[PDB]
CSV table of C-alpha atoms in Angstrom, one decimal:
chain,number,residue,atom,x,y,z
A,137,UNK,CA,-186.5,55.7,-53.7
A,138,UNK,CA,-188.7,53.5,-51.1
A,139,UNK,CA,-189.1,49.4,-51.6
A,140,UNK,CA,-191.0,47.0,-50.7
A,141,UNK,CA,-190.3,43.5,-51.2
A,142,UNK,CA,-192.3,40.3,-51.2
A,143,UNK,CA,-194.7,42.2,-48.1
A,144,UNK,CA,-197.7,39.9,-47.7
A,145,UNK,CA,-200.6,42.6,-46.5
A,146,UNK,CA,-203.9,41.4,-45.6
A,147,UNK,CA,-206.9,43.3,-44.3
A,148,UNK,CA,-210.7,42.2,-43.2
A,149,UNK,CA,-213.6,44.5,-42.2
A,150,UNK,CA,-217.0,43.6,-41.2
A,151,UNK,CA,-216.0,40.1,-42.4
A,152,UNK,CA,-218.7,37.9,-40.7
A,153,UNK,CA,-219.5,34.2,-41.0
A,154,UNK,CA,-215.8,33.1,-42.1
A,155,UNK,CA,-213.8,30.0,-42.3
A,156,UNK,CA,-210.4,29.8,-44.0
A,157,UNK,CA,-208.9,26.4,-44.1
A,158,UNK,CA,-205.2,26.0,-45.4
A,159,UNK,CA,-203.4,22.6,-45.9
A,160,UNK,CA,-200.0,22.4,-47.3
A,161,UNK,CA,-199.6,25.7,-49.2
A,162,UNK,CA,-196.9,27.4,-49.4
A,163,UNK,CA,-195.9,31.6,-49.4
A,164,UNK,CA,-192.4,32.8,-50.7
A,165,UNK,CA,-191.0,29.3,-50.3
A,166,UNK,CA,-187.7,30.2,-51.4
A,167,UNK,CA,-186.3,33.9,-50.8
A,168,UNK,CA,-182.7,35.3,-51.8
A,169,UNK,CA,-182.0,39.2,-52.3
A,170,UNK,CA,-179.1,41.5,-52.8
A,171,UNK,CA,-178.8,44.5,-52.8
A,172,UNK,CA,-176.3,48.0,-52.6
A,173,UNK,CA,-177.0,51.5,-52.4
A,174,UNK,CA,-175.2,54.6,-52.9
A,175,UNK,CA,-172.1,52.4,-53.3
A,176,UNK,CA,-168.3,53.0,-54.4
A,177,UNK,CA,-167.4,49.8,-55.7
A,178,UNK,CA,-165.8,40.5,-55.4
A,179,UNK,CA,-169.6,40.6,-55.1
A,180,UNK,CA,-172.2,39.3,-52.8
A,181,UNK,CA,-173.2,35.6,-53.8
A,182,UNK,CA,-176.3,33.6,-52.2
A,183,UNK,CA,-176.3,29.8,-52.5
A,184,UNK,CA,-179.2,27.3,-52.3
A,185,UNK,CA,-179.2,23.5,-52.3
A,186,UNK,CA,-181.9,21.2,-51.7
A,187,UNK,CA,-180.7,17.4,-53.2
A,188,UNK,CA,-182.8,14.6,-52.7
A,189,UNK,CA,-180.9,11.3,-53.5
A,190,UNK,CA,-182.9,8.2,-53.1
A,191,UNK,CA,-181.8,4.8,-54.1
A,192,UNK,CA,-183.6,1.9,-53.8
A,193,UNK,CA,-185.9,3.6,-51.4
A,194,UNK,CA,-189.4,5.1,-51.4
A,195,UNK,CA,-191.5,8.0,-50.1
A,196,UNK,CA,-188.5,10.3,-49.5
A,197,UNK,CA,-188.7,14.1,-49.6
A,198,UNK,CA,-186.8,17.0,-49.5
A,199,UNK,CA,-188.5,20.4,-49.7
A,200,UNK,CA,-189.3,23.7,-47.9
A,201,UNK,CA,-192.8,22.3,-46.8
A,202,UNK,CA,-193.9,18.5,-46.7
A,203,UNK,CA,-197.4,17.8,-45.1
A,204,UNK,CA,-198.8,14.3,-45.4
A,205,UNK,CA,-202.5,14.0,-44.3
A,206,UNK,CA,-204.9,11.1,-43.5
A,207,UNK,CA,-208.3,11.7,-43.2
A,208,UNK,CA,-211.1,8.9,-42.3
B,26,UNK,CA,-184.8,55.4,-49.0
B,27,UNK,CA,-186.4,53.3,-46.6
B,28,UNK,CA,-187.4,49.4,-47.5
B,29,UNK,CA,-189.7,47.0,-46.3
B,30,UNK,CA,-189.1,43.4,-47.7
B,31,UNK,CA,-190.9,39.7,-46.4
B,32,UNK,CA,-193.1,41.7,-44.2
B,33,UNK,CA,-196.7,40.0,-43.0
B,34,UNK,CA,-199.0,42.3,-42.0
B,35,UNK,CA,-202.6,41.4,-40.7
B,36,UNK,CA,-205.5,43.5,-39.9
B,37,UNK,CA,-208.9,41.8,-38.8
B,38,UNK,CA,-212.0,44.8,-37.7
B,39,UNK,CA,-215.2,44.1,-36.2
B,40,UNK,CA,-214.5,40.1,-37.6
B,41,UNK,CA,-217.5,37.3,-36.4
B,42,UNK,CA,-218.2,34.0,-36.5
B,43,UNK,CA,-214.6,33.5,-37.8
B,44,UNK,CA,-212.7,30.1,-38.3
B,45,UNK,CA,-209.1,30.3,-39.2
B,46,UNK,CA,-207.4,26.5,-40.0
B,47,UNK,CA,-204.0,25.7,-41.2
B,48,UNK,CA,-202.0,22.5,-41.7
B,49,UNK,CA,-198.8,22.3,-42.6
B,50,UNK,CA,-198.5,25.9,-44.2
B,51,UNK,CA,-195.4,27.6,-44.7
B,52,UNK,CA,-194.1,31.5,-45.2
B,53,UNK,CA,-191.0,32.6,-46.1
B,54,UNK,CA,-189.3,28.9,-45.9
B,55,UNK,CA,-185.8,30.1,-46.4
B,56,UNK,CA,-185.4,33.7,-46.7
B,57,UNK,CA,-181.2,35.1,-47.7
B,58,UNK,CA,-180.4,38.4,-48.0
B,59,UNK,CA,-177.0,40.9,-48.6
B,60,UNK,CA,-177.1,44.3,-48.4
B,61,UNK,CA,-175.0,47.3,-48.3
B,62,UNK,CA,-175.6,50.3,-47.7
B,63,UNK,CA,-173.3,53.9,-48.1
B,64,UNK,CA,-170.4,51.8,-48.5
B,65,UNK,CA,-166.9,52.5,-50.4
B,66,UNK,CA,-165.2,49.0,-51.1
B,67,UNK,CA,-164.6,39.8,-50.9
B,68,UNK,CA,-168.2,40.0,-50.7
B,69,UNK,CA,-170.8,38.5,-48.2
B,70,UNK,CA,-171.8,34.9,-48.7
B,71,UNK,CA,-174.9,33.2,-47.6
B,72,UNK,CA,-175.2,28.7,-48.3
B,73,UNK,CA,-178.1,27.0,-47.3
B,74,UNK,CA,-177.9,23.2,-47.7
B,75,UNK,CA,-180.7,20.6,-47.4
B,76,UNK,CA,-179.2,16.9,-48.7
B,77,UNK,CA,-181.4,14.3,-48.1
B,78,UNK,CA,-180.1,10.6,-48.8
B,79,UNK,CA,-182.2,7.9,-48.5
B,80,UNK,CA,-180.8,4.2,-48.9
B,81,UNK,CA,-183.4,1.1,-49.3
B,82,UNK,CA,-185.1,3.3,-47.1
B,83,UNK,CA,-188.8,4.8,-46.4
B,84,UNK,CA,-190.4,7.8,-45.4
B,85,UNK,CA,-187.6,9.9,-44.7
B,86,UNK,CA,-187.7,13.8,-45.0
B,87,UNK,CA,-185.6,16.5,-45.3
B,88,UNK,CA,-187.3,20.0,-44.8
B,89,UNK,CA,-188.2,23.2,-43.1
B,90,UNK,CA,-191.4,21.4,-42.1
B,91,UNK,CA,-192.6,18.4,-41.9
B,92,UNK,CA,-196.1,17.8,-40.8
B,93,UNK,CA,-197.8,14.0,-40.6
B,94,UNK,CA,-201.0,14.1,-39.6
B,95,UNK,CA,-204.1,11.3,-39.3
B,96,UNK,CA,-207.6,11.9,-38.0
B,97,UNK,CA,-210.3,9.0,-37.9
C,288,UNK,CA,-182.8,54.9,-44.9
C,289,UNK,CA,-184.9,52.5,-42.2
C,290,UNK,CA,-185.1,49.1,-42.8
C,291,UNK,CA,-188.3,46.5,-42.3
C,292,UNK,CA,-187.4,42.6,-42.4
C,293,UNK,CA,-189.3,40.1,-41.9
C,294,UNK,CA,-191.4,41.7,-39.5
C,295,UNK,CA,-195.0,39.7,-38.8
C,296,UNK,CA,-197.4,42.4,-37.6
C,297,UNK,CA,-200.8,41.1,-36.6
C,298,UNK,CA,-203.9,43.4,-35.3
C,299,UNK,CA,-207.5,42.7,-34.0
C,300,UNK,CA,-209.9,45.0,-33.3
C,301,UNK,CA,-213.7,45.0,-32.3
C,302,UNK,CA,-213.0,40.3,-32.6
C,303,UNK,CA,-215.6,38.2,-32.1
C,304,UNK,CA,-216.3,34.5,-32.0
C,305,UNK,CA,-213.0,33.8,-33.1
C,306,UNK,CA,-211.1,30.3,-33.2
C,307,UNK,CA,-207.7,30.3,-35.0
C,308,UNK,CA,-206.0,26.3,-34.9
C,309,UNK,CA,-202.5,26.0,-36.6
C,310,UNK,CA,-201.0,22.2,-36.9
C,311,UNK,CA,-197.5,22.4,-37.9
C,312,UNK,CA,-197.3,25.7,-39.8
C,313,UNK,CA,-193.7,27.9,-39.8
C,314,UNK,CA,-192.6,31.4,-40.5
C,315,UNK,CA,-189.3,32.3,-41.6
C,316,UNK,CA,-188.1,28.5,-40.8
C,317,UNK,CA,-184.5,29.4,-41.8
C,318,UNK,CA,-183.6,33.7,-42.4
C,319,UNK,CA,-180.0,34.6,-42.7
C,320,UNK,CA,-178.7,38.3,-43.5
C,321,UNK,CA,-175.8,40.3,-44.0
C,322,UNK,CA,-175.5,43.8,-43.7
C,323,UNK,CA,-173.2,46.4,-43.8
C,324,UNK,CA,-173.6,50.1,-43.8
C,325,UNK,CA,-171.0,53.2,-44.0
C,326,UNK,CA,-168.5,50.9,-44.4
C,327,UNK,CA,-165.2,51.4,-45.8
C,328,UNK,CA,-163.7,48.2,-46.8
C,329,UNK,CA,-163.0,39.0,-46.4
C,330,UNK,CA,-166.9,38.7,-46.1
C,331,UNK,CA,-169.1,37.3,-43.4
C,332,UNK,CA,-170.6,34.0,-43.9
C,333,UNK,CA,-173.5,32.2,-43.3
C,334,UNK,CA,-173.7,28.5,-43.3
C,335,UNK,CA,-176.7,26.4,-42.9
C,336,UNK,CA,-176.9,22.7,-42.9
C,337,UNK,CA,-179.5,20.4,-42.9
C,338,UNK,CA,-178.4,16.9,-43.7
C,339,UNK,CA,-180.6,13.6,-43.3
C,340,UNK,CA,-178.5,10.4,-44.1
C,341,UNK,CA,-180.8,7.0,-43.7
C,342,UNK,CA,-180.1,4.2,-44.2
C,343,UNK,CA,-181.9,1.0,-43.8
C,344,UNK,CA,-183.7,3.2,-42.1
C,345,UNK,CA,-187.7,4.5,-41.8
C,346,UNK,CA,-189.8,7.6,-40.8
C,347,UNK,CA,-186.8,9.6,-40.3
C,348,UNK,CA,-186.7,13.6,-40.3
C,349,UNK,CA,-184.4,16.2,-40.4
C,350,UNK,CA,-186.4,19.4,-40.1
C,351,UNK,CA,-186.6,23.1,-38.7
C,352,UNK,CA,-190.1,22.0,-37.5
C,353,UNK,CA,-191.8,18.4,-37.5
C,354,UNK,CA,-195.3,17.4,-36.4
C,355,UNK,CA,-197.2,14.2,-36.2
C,356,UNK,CA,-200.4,13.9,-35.2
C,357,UNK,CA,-202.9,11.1,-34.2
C,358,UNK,CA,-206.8,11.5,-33.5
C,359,UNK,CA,-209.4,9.1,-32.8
D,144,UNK,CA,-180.8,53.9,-40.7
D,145,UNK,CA,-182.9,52.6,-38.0
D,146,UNK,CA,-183.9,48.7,-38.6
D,147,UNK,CA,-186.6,46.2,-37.2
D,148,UNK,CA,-185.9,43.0,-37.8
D,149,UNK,CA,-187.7,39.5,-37.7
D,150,UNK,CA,-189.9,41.5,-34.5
D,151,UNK,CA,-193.0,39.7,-34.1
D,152,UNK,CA,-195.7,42.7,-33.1
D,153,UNK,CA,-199.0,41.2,-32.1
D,154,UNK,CA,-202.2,43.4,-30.6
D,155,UNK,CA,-205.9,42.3,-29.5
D,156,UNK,CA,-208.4,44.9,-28.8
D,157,UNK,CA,-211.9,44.6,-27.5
D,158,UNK,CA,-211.8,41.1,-28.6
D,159,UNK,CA,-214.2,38.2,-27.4
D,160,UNK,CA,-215.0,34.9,-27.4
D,161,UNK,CA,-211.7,33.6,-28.7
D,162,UNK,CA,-209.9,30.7,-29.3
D,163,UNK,CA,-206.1,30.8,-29.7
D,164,UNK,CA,-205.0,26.7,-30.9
D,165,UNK,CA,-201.8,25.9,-31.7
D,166,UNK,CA,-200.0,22.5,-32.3
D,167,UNK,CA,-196.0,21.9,-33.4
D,168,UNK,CA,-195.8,25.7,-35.1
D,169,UNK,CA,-192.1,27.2,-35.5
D,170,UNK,CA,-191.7,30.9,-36.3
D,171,UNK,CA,-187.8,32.0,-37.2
D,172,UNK,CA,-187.2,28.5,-36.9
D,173,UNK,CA,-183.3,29.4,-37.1
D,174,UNK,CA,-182.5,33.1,-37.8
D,175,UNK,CA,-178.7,33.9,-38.3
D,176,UNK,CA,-177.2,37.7,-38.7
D,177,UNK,CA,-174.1,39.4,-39.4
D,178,UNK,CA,-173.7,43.4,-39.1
D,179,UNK,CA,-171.2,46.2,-39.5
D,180,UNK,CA,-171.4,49.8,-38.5
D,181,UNK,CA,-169.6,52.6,-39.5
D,182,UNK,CA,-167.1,49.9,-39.6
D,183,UNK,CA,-163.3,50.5,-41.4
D,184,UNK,CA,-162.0,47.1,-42.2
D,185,UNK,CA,-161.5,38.4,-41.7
D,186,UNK,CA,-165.2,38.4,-41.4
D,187,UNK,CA,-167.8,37.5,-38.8
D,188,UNK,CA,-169.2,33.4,-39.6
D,189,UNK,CA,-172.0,31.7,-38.5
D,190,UNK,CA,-172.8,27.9,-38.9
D,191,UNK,CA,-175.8,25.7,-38.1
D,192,UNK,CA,-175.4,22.3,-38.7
D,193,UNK,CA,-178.7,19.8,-37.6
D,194,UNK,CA,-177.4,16.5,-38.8
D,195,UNK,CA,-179.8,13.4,-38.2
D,196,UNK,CA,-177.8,9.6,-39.2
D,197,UNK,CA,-180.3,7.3,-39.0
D,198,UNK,CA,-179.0,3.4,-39.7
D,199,UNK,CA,-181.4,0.4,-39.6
D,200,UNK,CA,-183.3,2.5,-37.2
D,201,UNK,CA,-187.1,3.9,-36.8
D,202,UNK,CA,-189.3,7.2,-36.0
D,203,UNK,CA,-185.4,9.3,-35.4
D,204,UNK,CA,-185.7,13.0,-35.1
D,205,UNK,CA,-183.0,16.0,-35.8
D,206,UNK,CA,-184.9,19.1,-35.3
D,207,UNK,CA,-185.5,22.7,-33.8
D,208,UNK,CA,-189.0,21.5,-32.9
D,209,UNK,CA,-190.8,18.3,-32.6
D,210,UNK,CA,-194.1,17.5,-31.6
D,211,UNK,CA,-195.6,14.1,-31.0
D,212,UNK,CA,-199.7,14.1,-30.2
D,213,UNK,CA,-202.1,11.3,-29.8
D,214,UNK,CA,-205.6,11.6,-28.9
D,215,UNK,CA,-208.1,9.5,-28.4
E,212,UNK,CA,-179.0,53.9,-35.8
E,213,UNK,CA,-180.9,51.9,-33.2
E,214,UNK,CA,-182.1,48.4,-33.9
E,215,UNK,CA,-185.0,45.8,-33.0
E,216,UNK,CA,-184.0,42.3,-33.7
E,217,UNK,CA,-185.8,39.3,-33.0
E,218,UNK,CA,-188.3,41.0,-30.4
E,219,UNK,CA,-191.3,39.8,-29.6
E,220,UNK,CA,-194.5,42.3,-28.7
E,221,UNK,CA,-198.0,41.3,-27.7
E,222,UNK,CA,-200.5,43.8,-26.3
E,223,UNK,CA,-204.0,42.7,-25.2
E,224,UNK,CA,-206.7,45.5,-24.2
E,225,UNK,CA,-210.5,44.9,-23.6
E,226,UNK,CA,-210.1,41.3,-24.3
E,227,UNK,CA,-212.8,38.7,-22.5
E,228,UNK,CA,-213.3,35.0,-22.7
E,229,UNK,CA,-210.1,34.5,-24.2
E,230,UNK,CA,-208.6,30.7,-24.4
E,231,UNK,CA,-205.3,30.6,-25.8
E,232,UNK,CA,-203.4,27.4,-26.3
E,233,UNK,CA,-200.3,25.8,-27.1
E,234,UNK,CA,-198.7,22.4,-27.5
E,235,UNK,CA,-194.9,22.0,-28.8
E,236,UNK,CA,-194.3,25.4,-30.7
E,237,UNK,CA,-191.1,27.2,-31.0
E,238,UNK,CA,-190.3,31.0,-31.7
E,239,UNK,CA,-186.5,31.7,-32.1
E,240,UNK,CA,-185.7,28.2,-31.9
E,241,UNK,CA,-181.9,29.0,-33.0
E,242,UNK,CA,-180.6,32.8,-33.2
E,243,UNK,CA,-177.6,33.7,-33.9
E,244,UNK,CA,-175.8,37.2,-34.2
E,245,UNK,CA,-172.6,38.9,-35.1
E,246,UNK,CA,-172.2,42.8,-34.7
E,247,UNK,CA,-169.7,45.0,-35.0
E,248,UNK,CA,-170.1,49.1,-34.5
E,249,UNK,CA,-168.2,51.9,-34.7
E,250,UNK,CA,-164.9,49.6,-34.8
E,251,UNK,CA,-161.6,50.0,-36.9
E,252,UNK,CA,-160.6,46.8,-37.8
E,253,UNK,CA,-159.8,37.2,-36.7
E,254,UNK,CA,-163.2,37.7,-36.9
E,255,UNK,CA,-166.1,36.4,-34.2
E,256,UNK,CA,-168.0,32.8,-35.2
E,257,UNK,CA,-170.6,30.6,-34.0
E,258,UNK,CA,-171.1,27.8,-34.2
E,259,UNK,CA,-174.3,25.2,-33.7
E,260,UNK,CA,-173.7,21.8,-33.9
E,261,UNK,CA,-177.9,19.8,-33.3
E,262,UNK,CA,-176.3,16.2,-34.0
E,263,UNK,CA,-178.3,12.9,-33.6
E,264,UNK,CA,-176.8,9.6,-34.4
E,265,UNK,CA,-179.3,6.3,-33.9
E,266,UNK,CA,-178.2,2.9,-34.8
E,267,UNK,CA,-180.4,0.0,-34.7
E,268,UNK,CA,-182.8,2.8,-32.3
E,269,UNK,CA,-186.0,3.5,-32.1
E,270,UNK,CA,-187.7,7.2,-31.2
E,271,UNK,CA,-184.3,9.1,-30.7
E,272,UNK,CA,-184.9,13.3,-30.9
E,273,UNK,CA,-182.3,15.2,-30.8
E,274,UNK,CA,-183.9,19.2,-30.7
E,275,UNK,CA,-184.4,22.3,-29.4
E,276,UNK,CA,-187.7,20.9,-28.4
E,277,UNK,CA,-189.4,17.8,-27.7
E,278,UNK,CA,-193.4,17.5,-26.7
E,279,UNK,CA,-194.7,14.3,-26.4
E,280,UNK,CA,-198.4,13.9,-25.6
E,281,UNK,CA,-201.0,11.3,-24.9
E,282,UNK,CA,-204.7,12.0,-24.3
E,283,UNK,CA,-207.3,9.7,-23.7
């Protein structure tokens, strides 16, 4: 049978007199699938690393998204 | 049977007076898939690495996106 | 069976007064996909590295995307 | 199967008065595929490596996409 | 079955006082394919090497991209 998988569907109509603001988010950030069908069977294998080291040091960052705002 | 997967879709009708703002947003950051399909069988292999090392160090970043941003 | 991935669609009908702004937004920063079909059967691969090293070292980025922004 | 894949579709009708604004954006920042057809079977690889070293040093950039903006 | 990868569509109809703008952004800043079809069977690689090495260095990019923008 039919899927669907992390689809993001949006729809406006008439929609009048709209503001959408947005800082720093995040959608499906990290994704990994598998996956067989109709299959006569060592496997399928998805890795993900994100290290931060930081020593002695400041402000560091490892991600999928990083925004840093200053507003006055 | 048919798949959809990390589609975004979008439909705007007879909008006005709209605003749409983003900073530093993300979708689908890192996005891994395997897939087989019909199949009569080592395996697929999908990495993704994102070290980050810092040392007495400042501000550093490691990422999909990085967005800095001032406004006065 | 047909296959959607990681299709962005977008429609507008009818629009008016309409800004859209977008400071250092992504979509589908890193996508990485295997995919075999009717096969009869040592793997493909994917690899993806993003290494920062600093050291001593400032403001630094190691990034699918990076932004900065100044305003007076 | 048929298959769309990472296809951006965009359509505008009738619209007005718009503003498009975009600063620093990414879409399928890096986008890496492997693929096998009807195939009877050492496997397909892909690498990406964006390494940034940075040593007693300032403001360095590794990247797909960089922006810079000042405005007064 | 026939494939779409990676393609980018825009249709505009009707449209009036339209602005569209765009400072620094990427589509497809990397894209990488294998494909094999059909075939009876060392295996084809890429490879994608984005290095930057700064010592002592000030406002080094190594990219895809690289906008740099001053408005006064």
């Amino acid at each position: 049978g039919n899927w669907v998988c992390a689809a993001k569907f949006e729809s406006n109509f008439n929609t009048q007199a709209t503001n959408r603001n947005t800082d720093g988010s995040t959608d499906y950030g990290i994704l990994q699938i598998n996956s067989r069908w109709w299959c006569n069977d060592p496997g399928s294998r998805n890795l993900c690393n994100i290290p931060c080291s930081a020593l002695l040091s400041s402000d560091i960052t490892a991600s999928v998204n990083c925004a840093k705002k200053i507003v006055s």
